[PDB]
Amino acid sequence: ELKNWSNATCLQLAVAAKHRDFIAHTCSQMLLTDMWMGRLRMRKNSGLKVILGILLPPSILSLEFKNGRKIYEFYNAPIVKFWFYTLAYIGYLMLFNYIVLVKMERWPSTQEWIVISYIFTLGIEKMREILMSEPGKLLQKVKVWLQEYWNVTDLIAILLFSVGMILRLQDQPFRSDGRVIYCVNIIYWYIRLLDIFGVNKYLGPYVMMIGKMMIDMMYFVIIMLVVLMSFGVARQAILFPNEEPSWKLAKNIFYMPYWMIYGEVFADQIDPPCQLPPCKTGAWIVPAIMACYLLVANILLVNLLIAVFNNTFFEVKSISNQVWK
Amino acid sequence: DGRVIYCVNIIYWYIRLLDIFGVNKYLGPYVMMIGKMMIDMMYFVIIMLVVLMSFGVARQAILFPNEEPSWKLAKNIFYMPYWMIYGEVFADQIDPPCQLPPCKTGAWIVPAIMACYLLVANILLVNLLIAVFNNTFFEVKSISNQVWK
Numbered sequence: 063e064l065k066n067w068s069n070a071t072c073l074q075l076a077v078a079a080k081h082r083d084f085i086a087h088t089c090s091q092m093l094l095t096d097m098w099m100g101r102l103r104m105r106k107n108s109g110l111k112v113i114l115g116i117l118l119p120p121s122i123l124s125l126e127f128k129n130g131r132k133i134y135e136f137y138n139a140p141i142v143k144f145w146f147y148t149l150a151y152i153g154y155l156m157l158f159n160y161i162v163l164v165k166m167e168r169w170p171s172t173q174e175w176i177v178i179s180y181i182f183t184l185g186i187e188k189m190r191e192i193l194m195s196e197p198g199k200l201l202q203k204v205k206v207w208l209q210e211y212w213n214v215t216d217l218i219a220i221l222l223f224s225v226g227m228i229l230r231l232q233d234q235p236f237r238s239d240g241r242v243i244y245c246v247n248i249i250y251w252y253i254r255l256l257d258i259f260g261v262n263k264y265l266g267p268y269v270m271m272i273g274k275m276m277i278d279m280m281y282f283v284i285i286m287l288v289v290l291m292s293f294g295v296a297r298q299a300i301l302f303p304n305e306e307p308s309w310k311l312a313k314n315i316f317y318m319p320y321w322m323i324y325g326e327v328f329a330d331q332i333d334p335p336c337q338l339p340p341c342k343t344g345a346w347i348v349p350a351i352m353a354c355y356l357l358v359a360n361i362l363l364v365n366l367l368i369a370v371f372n373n374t375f376f377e378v379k380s381i382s383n384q385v386w387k
Numbered sequence: 388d389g390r391v392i393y394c395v396n397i398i399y400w401y402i403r404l405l406d407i408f409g410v411n412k413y414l415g416p417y418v419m420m421i422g423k424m425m426i427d428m429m430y431f432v433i434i435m436l437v438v439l440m441s442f443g444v445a446r447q448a449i450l451f452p453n454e455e456p457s458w459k460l461a462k463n464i465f466y467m468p469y470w471m472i473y474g475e476v477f478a479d480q481i482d483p484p485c486q487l488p489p490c491k492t493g494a495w496i497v498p499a500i501m502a503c504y505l506l507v508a509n510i511l512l513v514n515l516l517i518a519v520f521n522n523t524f525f526e527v528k529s530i531s532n533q534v535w536k
């Protein structure tokens with residue numbers, strides 16, 4: 063503790079300054095690992111012993127500790143809290159899969175009630191986290207808690223699932239709509255496992271690299287979108303010239319050109335052999351347009367995107383390593 | 388069952404030929420590179436498994452809302468989404484054209500999920516895997532050459 067500097071250790075001063083090169087030093091990492099290990103003395107092979115201890119309380123006594131009171135010492139380490147939370151989340155995910163896979167009855171099953179309890183208590187904990195924030199302004203605590211993206215997506219998912227639950231406890235059609243809302247919602251909870259993955263040394267950097275390659279890829283999404291839209295409009299306006307205006311036109315533009323570049327290159331679905339059906343005027347340009355579009359979208363743009371990912375990997379790798387540390 | 392165990396054995400004995408192959412100068416290093424590249428690949432296999440499971444659960448729970456609890460459910464989650472990203476993207480088996488069948492509630496979301504799932508699994512993760520294999524090749528090659536010698 064530093065008396066002159068208002069009871070702040072060097073680590074807190076370094077963190078407040080956003081000094082990445084200081085925290086990422088070897089000594090700071092060793093100190094953080096020692097603090098994370100708590101009061102235990104398992105170094106060579108940990109984690110599995112933590113799982114064995116949390117599953118079997120008698121296994122706690124056969125551990126080496128640092129200088130009755132052993133159980134409270136073990137259970138309050140950060141690592142065992144993390145593993146307890148991870149096991150709880152795995153159980154919640156299993157129950158959320160089970161409730162949506164099988165048929166849903168009029169009133170919720172007990173597993174569904176467990177899922178509702180999990181969501182409600184997690185919302186309560188988030189509310190507690192908001193309420194006990196450091197700044198003294200009740201409006202600035204919300205804006206200082208909405209600084210990450212995970213705690214924003216959690217709020218959105220909690221609100222959406224609450225809306226779906228309220229819609230569920232109704233008659234049959236609104237119950238089906240609530241089921242569809244649950245089906246959409248489960249995707250986010252499955253994706254959220256990357257936050258749990260982020261503890262592992264070799265997975266966090268990969269997640270950060272993915273997060274940056276998303277914005278690296280967002281442009282070659284747009285260019286391929288333009289090419290695909292052009293081809294789709296051309297094929298739709300060549301093959302079918304006698305269609306009344308309907309919203310089905312907006313589906314044929316994006317459907318077939320998108321499914322064509324992913325292996326469903328069908329010469330019978332498009333370019334029909336027109337006993338034999340009558341041939342449309344100017345319909346012999348569809349194979350040529352398709353050939354050019356496939357050549358551009360599968361040999362040029364994807365290879366250029368591969369090159370872009372390849373040549374900017376060292377910088378992103380180093381930055382992600384520093385940020386995770 | 389005897390011949391099935393024989394099939395498992397012949398799988399292993401066919402794989403065992405690489406130890407004989409590791410005599411030639413240009414084949415031992417490639418095998419010892421394959422081992423470390425598999426060690427690298429396992430992580431992206433895990434991530435793709437998570438994404439695949441998410442899409443499979445969403446599809447199964449959207450399209451069929453009146454199924455019974457059976458072990459066939461654990462197959463439909465993994466089977467079709469895994470075979471989809473390997474060149475079988477048949478848009479007829481997925482999203483049936485709901486004379487015409489009555490549409491399921493929210494049966495239009497499935498192609499919207501499919502677009503994002505294919506975009507992630509064929510344009511992002513595999514390209515990042517290629518980049519990982521590319522930027523960590525020289526040191527692996529040198530170490531493999533030394534260990535073979």
Ligand SMILES: CCCCCCCC(=O)OC[C@H](COP(=O)(O)O[C@@H]1[C@H](O)[C@H](O)[C@@H](OP(=O)(O)O)[C@H](OP(=O)(O)O)[C@H]1O)OC(=O)CCCCCCC
Nearest residue numbers: 095105106107108109110113148255258259260261262263
């Ligand atoms: C779904 C998982 C999401 C949570 C992810 C959980 C985070 C995660 O993936 O790692 C935790 C644990 C291994 O990590 P853990 O910290 O326990 O132990 C590390 C490991 O022994 C390394 O080999 C050590 O050296 P290095 O690093 O090689 O140099 C390292 O010491 P250090 O030399 O570094 O000081 C040790 O810290 O693995 C499991 O999940 C076991 C349960 C199996 C899974 C059980 C379920 C199948």
Ligand SMILES: COCC(CCO[C@H]1CC[C@@]2(C)C(=CC[C@H]3[C@@H]4C[C@@H]5O[C@]6(CC[C@@H](C)CO6)[C@@H](C)[C@@H]5[C@@]4(C)CC[C@@H]32)C1)COC
Nearest residue numbers: 155156157158159160163440455456457458459460461464
């Ligand atoms: C053919 O007739 C069968 C019948 C017995 C039926 O028993 C059922 C018991 C529930 C059970 C085991 C069954 C089918 C889906 C099973 C789900 C698959 C899910 O997968 C997992 C997959 C991976 C997890 C990550 C997510 O959930 C489970 C939560 C989930 C899971 C294992 C819950 C358990 C379900 C079978 C015969 O007896 C008379």
Ligand SMILES: COCC(CCO[C@H]1CC[C@@]2(C)C(=CC[C@H]3[C@@H]4C[C@@H]5O[C@]6(CC[C@@H](C)CO6)[C@@H](C)[C@@H]5[C@@]4(C)CC[C@@H]32)C1)COC
Nearest residue numbers: 288291292295305306307308309310311312313314315316
């Ligand atoms: C089933 O019967 C339908 C009928 C109502 C029909 O209303 C029509 C109004 C015009 C509208 C919305 C319709 C079909 C093609 C639609 C085009 C698709 C084009 O796509 C876009 C695609 C993307 C844009 C970038 C380019 O253009 C539009 C210029 C274009 C677009 C959105 C213009 C709008 C057109 C439906 C029901 O009423 C009784």
